[PDB]
């Protein structure tokens, strides 16, 4: 006998094609659930991400979802709607708390652990890796970045990483990047490791403008994206890695629907991200969409 309750979903932007696939997703969730939504936007913006939130409060929000900006800066923000014991969760990014609220999404360190192995295995005499890392304060990056450190240094000093900057988790910047340190380098590296698709498919972008060819150097991304699937398959990627966004989202909206409703439990969801290859495209979420 109940419908139309609101749900507030606070992404830091709606810039980056993974918030915008999270945004499609809680969409399509919220009419199958029978939900209000508000899917508020930070626009990259700590502060405008403080201020929606005060305003998920204000505008009645029965549960709210957060995918916050920065690990300490939105903190304050997500204090106040524990305290107005409004139903929480973080998805994807989270804040540093003693006491967090449910979390869904992959497992950005092991995640991370993942990619570095599979880096490994494919050169297993060691390697020099340009890496190009996320936002700084995003504790996505943060995670998934120290999964990737930790994992190579395991794999000894024969793992060399000789660039390892941050590009925001910006397209433009991995191009950019690319384009600038390449030429400086007295040789060649390996690998790109991108903690990101969009970074890596900028990286390729830079590769294919110096002459590049497919293959010539290793490309890993996260998030599987089509573009990213696209480019596993014809070889200018070596793999991506699926956070499974459409099941993070839906399960997040159930279970906090589901505590609106029948004041079920908020458990949250962890589990690891899938690593796709050329021989595993299938496997991911949106392998529908790779025409
Ligand atoms: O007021 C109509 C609303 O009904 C809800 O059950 C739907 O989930 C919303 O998508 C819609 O806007
Ligand atoms: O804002 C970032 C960005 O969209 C990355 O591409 C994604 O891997 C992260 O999970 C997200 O927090």
Known sequence: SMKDELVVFSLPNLS????????????????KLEIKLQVLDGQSSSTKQASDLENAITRGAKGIIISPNDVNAISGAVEEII???????TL?????????????????????????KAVKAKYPNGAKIILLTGQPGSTSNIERTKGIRDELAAGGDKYKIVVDQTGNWLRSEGLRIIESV???????????????????????EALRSQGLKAGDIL???????????????????????????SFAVSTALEQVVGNIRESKEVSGADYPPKIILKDNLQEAERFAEIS
């Open 16 to 31: 980056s094609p993974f918030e915008v696939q999270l945004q499609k997703v809680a969409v399509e969730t919220s009419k």
């Open 83 to 89: 305290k107005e014991k409004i139903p929480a969760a």
């Open 92 to 116: 994807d990014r989270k804040v540093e708390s003693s006491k967090p609220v449910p979390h869904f999404g992959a497992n950005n360190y092991t995640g991370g652990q993942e990619v570095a």
């Open 182 to 204: 390449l030429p400086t380098l007295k040789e060649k590296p390996e690998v790109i490791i991108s903690a990101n698709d969009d970074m890596a498919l900028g990286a390729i």
């Open 219 to 245: 490309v890993t991304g996260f998030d599987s994206t089509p573009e990213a699937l696209a480019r596993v398959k014809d070889g200018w990627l070596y793999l991506t890695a699926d956070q499974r966004p």
